[PDB]
Amino acid sequence: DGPEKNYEKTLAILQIESEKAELRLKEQEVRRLMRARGDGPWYQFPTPEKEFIDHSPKATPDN
């Protein structure tokens, strides 16, 4: 075919791998922040269910 083909194939592979490395480091920093503070979807540890509380009138006022 020629050298142009391999040259530009190499450029494509290079941008692929660079984008992938940047995405990996971004993933690591994002996981760091998400676990350090539960501001995101991941590392959201559960809490007690709010729907199984009884809000009805009790037998005593001072519930």
């Binding site: 995405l23 971004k26 994002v30 996981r31 922040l33 501001d39 995101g40 979807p41 991941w42 540890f45």
Partner: protein
């Protein structure tokens, strides 16, 4: 770690969000690899029970191949949906908290000065 993700329906294989993902080709290299796994499984089951190999259980081999591919297709659809969920949450998070991911821009090799280490 994404089990606490909002909208995470419990014990749901393929949410309707996954239906927007492009599915596999059905010619996919790992799917035909799973078919090869099934073929070798049939061959090994023949070798273990002292039967002819490549000649005995042509319904069993076909069944193994079909099982492997028919499971791998849906498992792979699920895994692609999961990696997509990962990337979606990550891009949304960098969009939400840009200050922790500053818009960095770097200098050229003319302005910076890395030290020279002679071999000699």
């Amino acid at each position: 770690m994404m089990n606490g993700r909002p909208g995470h329906e419990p014990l749901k294989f393929l949410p309707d969000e996954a239906r927007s993902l492009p599915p596999p080709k059905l010619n996919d290299p790992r799917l035909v690899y799973m078919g090869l796994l099934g073929y070798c499984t049939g061959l090994m089951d023949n070798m273990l029970r002292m039967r002819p190999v490549m000649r005995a259980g042509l319904h069993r081999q076909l069944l193994f191949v079909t099982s492997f591919v028919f499971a791998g297709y849906f498992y792979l659809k699920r895994q692609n949906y999961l990696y997509a969920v990962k990337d979606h949450d990550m891009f949304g998070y960098i969009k939400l908290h840009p200050e922790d991911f500053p818009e960095k821009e770097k200098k050229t090799y003319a302005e910076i000065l890395e030290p020279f280490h002679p071999v000699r």
